[PDB]
Symmetry: D3
Subunit: 279 residues, 6 copies
């Protein structure tokens, strides 16, 4: 099993979770968020999505977490098979039909932390789309299976799952993945450019933690700017908003800005003299 | 006073609000969300942002609400002045909430709209402004701050690049009529009638197909917001497909385990 | 020879074709569109482009066709050589017809794909290539020409900016396997099996929801094609909307001269 | 009446048009394409769109025509009303034809421009409007429809995002002067002089270098149209390159079976 | 005459300028760069462009200069006419220099702004125009040239796509006030007061945080300028981060060959 | 040692160079520009960047130079090891000069390419790498730095978003062959043959039409670089136009004080 209990501690306040598990590493600034319905191939129901959203939002707001590992628990009790995520499982009509998984994609995209998907088995439909939006993907050599099946049922992910996949594997390969909906292995998707590295199944989370540790070893501020720099143009004004918001925060810390805030409350004319027009 | 108390009821469940008020119209599919710190020119402190986010997010999830009027309460009990929102005393999360919600948000600028408050007006779908009292000022750079996101770059998609750069670089105060001429204010209203007019705009939006309005909003956001724009618009497109006979057939043929039959459905061109 | 005559039937109405052949599969929603000048390495002349347009335009409007296989006939009777298309002896219009048609176009590169013929493979949705015989060469710059549109800039969205630049600046010849490594060729097939593989690909495409397939192609085009990409994708959203109960009510309330009742139709979020 | 019968001749080969008229100016490089269903406020049925496409495509390919005036015939014989085009009774193909044609297309809005007809005016390069009778109205969402393409997103590139949102979300009627203030109408003309003014603007356009006007149109389309926009502009650049002595040297050498001498042609910067 | 000799001193090191003048205000962090060929309507020859480049580059690299005033000297000694710049008697390099310099460049259009002269005004951050004498004309296409770059596409980001296309396609002469209405001119000033107003605008820009103004300009440029816009904005961000405690530590560790300690620096969200 | 002394001559007028070397090839239109501080792993100090900018700008202005080979001298005289460029001990200006120059720049990564040195390789048009000694490592975030421009966002347009994020966030060291597989290195060469191979690629580039190569490089930049990319590409197209009969006519007419006759020049479609 990829899961090594000795590396993980439950996060306080999440005793009520049924469809997701959430652990913090014993030492490292890393959390493990996982689908916890292996008996149904880790398909998500609206309750799952609510919990996933809650847990990732909590991880986003934890100042002592730099890396989220997103994965699926397993294996299945009914068949021994392995799944990361196999996709989706008048007032209330509206609130039922929530596009909640889309809100979860944006939370992954926008959070100032590196999210690594660890693909431990089937990554199908909305599950495949979740792997696509994560910053990095590591995959199980033996059991990772990628398959974009949406169009078999007349559905499609016309957003991050398709258009952003073309910015990883190129337009020819991403069209093939969607138009034919074939099943690919970890090594096939690594060769195309959507999986970063392939790991032995039992060592997938071990590799995920080495990756997280190398990320957490660098300047957190730099890692934040880099993720938003990578999102920026592809995300248009939203991209610029997140990236400029981090630049605004940086500026606030400077002597110049401290001068400027001084002046306003003190009530005098700000003094820009000390601060050159850099070029 | 633009506020007509008789028109509005408090939304249940928000008795602990201190910095924001939140009403639903007595008859219309319209809510009124307002800054409630008039003695401090409606500046937001972190608690105000928490509350604003909570109220708008509830508004977003209210299936019977079509339009959000976002405004400030007044006048100031200190100097009798008028403020929509004077900026900072999390606000990016609220900007994205306004931008992504599948409902039209109209800012009713009833007074000063400065700094962060000016940026909030810019990211709203529509803006109506008090002729007498709306004042637009982007002051950020006085204290060495800047909104380098929707407050500036998106403003330039309203008034064009020369006017947007003037607004930020000089930090002058602008009237409702000035901003209407430049293209950032949709209309000017008599101060006392600002909310009456807002309600009339809301009623006109609410009279059209809600499906179509939601699609148009995301269509206007789409390219400017890149893949996020695409994600929201395509998301609604996925919803529309879900409803079709084709997707029904697709879902049925999956469970009654069999090959789907697409022969009844053209390859439209 | 990749061509299996038993799988194909001539399309009615095209007896006069001289430079292109056009067949429909005996069973599948697939057509075969081929350069028919192997004596001249399948170079296109003006009349060739005209015919290729009419044929692809017909394929676009055929509601029982989901996939186009685009290839070159062969071998050359002069020298036994193999060519998909070697470029010009109007082609921009044919690129846009491939790009915008609501069906998956697969290029089967059975031989040289050079200059213009290289750019046609690039703009196709997918490419399969003959292991033994496909030869990819962008020679535009030798003769002072350039495809500064889809053949270059879109190629960079398949193989990345370093490779696409190499391909054009140096004009070297690449095998199917090389172009597969780089990302411009989806798969390599044995020469004799290229069309058999293309048909298996086409069958897998046509076994899915045609609606979802059309939506996905326009989703992949969207942002890269700017307002044109949004026009095609949103044009399909409009079509989906028209089918809904909401629009039906919208439309009837207009005809019956009453105010629309949107009340049964929730404000989705 | 804006139409001056003496100024125009029927274009040859269109004796079978019923829903559109197509004239060429007596002296100028200018055509007049007009909706011809005034009894029905110039709404388009599928046959109208077929004809409109055929006509505009013929004008695109007419090398002696520089400018298309696109307008609406009237008045209505039923009530005396004036209509440019009131929208739907393929139109996306017409929009790309106007967008992509290497000629300036001026919309002369002589009356109502509603729904799809409003979107046609938006996609034209320039719009002149009848002071007295132009009415701009974007009604789509009333019937649960929407133009999520050029008619909305591209309108926002003319009047800015706040006004474009306003126009669609409320569906109010606007006068020529209002749209001229907002930046969607270039100029307002006396009703009776609309075509006269149109022809004067056409003549000023036709007096300049046609190759330059072509490049400038494609320059204005380019970045908004993503890869399509790049394809059309680069396509014109390719054409310019083909004319150069450098290009000649490369073409000569190819057929002359020798290696080219780039010696004469310097390395610009 | 808008030039006030008493306000300006020559910049040291520039005695050899013949085609441009370059002054620094006696008191303010503002420079005056101006075309100095009034006898030929301030048309630029290659030597003019060399000098213009050298001067603006100097201004860019002058840390005590916050704002550049770019204008035209006059009147003409021949006819008493007034010209900002009438264009081409390398300019793309100057355009980029204006565009990328981390300082506000205000164009003061005191006279004719035609051809490349019009395009320079368009690329400046802000434009102030002489009420009586500013004339804006885009003439390129008369002689078969075009600015398909900032002069045309970026103008559409100020005035909208309809007005920008009119401006180029007809090549009419516009007044200061017409350009102001359309959105390409920020403000109109009495001719004699043009440089006084420009100094006042400069002083209001120079009164705010220079770092905020730098960032804002690159935020305005960013998405329009793609990866270049990103490069400039992110480069400023990189400069900010270098100053922080966190970066100081990172730097310490490397040089001291020890492992950095990030614990003091929180994961901001 | 990749450097073949017999192949290269010093360029006149750069005798004062300390941190960079500059050679022109004895026969070919290719220059060699190289970091010359192998004792400090070719790290650049500000003086190095000044010299690099100056040399590259000279090459950009040399009309008899088509290709720039950008590399690092060595080995280190202290430890026998090899570096292309280890980054910092102005560099954004150098990245832009490489990006915007109308010549192909090939980085020859003959050793460590780290930090700013890695980002220089990334912005080059092509990269060839030493099998045995090339080591690519993006170390920025180790000391709290980042290239948020071309070094990161443009790397993603070569190797794709997953790979670029890995390269930055983990900062691992990669080989030539690993980077070739990812898409950022065009080809791998035996170490002592790196420049021999670089010269062969240069010769293949220099044997095509220099005008086509220039337009190609700007086509590849265009959309990614927004309005800057359009400015550059449109700039070339304006040059092409200046050459035509139509533009010669427009010029003559204006000189001869007569109307232009555009009569002989068709409206191409």
């Amino acid at each position: 099993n990829p899961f090594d209990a000795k590396a993980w501690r439950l996060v306080d306040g999440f005793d009520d979770l049924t469809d997701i598990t959430y652990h913090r590493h014993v030492d490292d600034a890393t959390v493990r968020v996982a689908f916890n319905r292996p008996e149904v191939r880790n398909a998500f129901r609206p309750h799952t999505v609510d919990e996933l959203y809650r847990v990732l939002d909590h991880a986003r707001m934890s100042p002592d977490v730099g890396v989220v590992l997103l994965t699926g628990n397993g294996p299945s009790p009914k068949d021994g098979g392995w799944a990361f995520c196999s996709g989706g499982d008048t007032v209330d009509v509206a609130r039922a039909g929530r596009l909640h998984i889309l809100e979860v994609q944006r939370l992954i995209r926008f959070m100032p932390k590196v999210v690594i998907c660890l693909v431990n088995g089937w990554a199908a439909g909305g599950g495949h789309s979740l792997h696509v939006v994560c910053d990095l993907t590591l995959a199980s050599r033996e059991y990772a299976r990628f398959k974009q099946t949406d169009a078999d049922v007349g559905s499609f992910d016309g957003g991050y799952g398709s258009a952003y996949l073309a910015r990883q594997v190129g337009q020819k390969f991403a069209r093939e993945i969607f138009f034919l909906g074939r099943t690919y292995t970890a090594e096939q998707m690594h060769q195309m450019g959507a999986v970063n590295a392939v790991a032995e199944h039992a060592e997938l989370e071990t590799v995920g933690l080495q990756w997280a540790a190398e990320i957490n070893a660098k300047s957190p501020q730099a890692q934040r700017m880099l993720k938003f720099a990578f999102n920026l143009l592809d995300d248009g004004l939203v991209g610029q908003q997140l990236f400029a918001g981090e630049a605004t925060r940086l500026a606030y810390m400077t002597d110049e800005a401290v001068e400027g805030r001084d002046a306003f409350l003190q009530k005098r004319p700000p003094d820009w003299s000390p601060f050159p027009r850099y070029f």
